[PDB]
């Protein structure tokens, strides 16, 4: 029947998350404020809401200087802090960070490594095995912000930081640098779970509609992923008055940008009973960009194969007349823990129909509401709402499929 998804509602939610709150870094007060907002919104929708808390890694922050130049940095989660006075050591130019690039001269020095070829972890691991005191990785691409040198969930015993291209290029000419990094401990995040349960069905099939509500540092996260969070909530509003024998769980996942930490926690804590009842996960991540080229709505499965999510989406696209739906392979969002547990899942995201690429604003301060399209929210919202309606109406992954920006 009629499913009045309204993108204006989603836009309003994106404004609340990305403008009134701003960047929602995992573990920070902004993410906790966002969780309160999402929980409050779900309760308005007649949902049974719980907040599920979980520990996340220490958060590293600090500064870097050399020859009087202060350099903005982003510290890698899972690397070491410094003493409060900071770590001062000579710089060692290690090129791209292959094993061959570390001579005996590297021991006791801060390894300066250009991004490229190798993963950030491989670079940091090669430097540490070579006796480096710390690792500075500088971007090989221009960017508004220093790159995060994501370590693919590994732990490194020395500091690892990422800096901008022009800063690293200057650093290749300097003798030494000082790094000051503090670890903030006791970090926690949370998931917000709102359940629409059928009143007199015993052990119903479970359908998950999910989106992560955290963003990367310095990004307002309007599209990644205020958009998916907002479309998930508006779909919950639409489906509130839809009878169903399925148990529908709408979930806002925390700490996705650190490696799917919230969805991994959530799926890990499902009982075996719930896993057997688990039917399908529709994950929404980046569904509102205004970027003109991102005209194709992709359905990403971890193996690129069809599953129940694709079937329902294919059917929905036919019912609403939408011809720019494509099935493709992709991980690195919260559908992945569901897939690993054997539950049909997929991630919905707009992409360049030529190449699948996303907007240039991704993971930058320009991931802002200025670059959100209500028409894209509306079309994505109408498609996934119809797909979930089709599903509910009555009658281990490799590191590069888990993490984002690992090289
Ligand atoms: Zn995302
Ligand atoms: Zn992201």
Curated annotation (Swiss-Prot):
Query: So where does Zn(2+) 2 get bound?
Result: 224, 257, 363
Q: Tell me the InterPro entries matching this sequence.
A: M28_fam, PA_dom_sf, PA_domain, Peptidase_M28
Key words, A-Z: Aminopeptidase, Hydrolase, Metal-binding, Metalloprotease, Protease, Secreted, Signal, Zinc
List positions binding Zn(2+) 1: 212, 224, 285
Q: Temperature annotation for this entry?
A: Stable for 20 minutes at temperatures of up to 80 degrees Celsius.
* Main location class: secreted
SUPFAM superfamilies the record matches: PA domain, Zn-dependent exopeptidases
What is its cofactor? Zn(2+)
GO term, biological process aspect, one? proteolysis
Cite the cofactor comment.
Answer: Binds 2 Zn(2+) ions per subunit.
Database matches in Pfam families: PA, Peptidase_M28
GO MF annotation: an example: metalloexopeptidase activity
User: Which EC numbers characterise this protein's activity in its record?
Assistant: 3.4.11.6, 3.4.11.10
DNA-binding in keyword set: no
**Activity-pH dependence:** Optimum pH is 8-9.
Protease recorded as keyword: yes
- Quaternary structure note: Monomer.
Q: What does this protein do?
A: Catalyzes the hydrolysis of a range of N-terminal amino acids.
Q: Which family does it belong to?
A: Belongs to the peptidase M28 family. M28B subfamily.
| Protein's recorded name | Aminopeptidase YwaD
